[PDB]
C-alpha cells in the first residue's frame, strides 16, 4: 500500500528527495537499513503534522506530507548509505520513530553516498 522511490547514487554533500506514495488515502515514518545494521526509524510525522527526527539526520533531512510523504535529504554523508523504507509509524516517547505493529515492509529505495 506504500511505495518508495527517489533513491540513487550521489556524491557527499548532495541531495535527494524520496517519495512514499500510497495506493489510496492515508502516522508515517521513514526507516533505513545499512549492511550489517538494524533497521532504524529516522523521521516520522503524525496524522496532525508533528515530526520527529533521529539525531543522525536532524537539520539535514525533512519529512513532509502531501497521497504522498516525502523525505528531502540534504547535505548527504557516506553514512547515509542504506535502503530506505516508509511504513505506518508512531512517535513513541519514553522518543523514537517506531514501525506500527504488524507492518509489512515494501521494497524500499536504495541510496548510496560515495565519491
Which segments of 1-115 does DSSP mark as H helices, in order?
Answer: none
Experimental technique behind these coordinates: X-ray
17 neighbors 73 (Cβ within 8 angstroms): yes
What grid cell was written down for 51?
515530526
What would the CATH number be for the domain defined by 2-95? 2.60.40.10
Closest CA to 54 of 82, 35, 26, 15: 82
Q: Give the Cα separation of 34 and 82 in Å (integer).
A: 4
Amino acid at each position: 500500500q506504500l511505495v518508495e522511490s527517489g533513491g540513487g547514487l550521489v556524491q557527499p554533500g548532495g541531495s535527494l528527495r524520496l517519495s512514499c506514495e500510497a495506493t489510496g488515502n492515508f502516522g508515517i515514518g521513514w526507516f533505513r537499513q545499512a549492511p550489517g545494521k538494524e533497521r532504524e526509524g529516522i523521521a516520522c510525522i503524525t496524522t496532525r503534522g508533528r515530526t520527529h527526527y533521529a539525531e543522525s539526520v536532524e537539520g539535514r533531512f525533512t519529512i513532509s506530507t502531501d497521497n504522498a510523504v516525502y523525505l528531502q535529504m540534504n547535505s548527504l554523508k557516506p553514512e547515509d548509505t542504506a535502503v530506505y523504507y516508509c511504513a505506518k509509524a508512531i512517535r513513541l516517547t519514553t522518543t523514537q520513530c517506531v514501525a506500527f505493529p504488524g507492518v509489512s515492509w515494501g521494497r524500499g529505495t536504495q541510496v548510496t553516498v560515495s565519491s
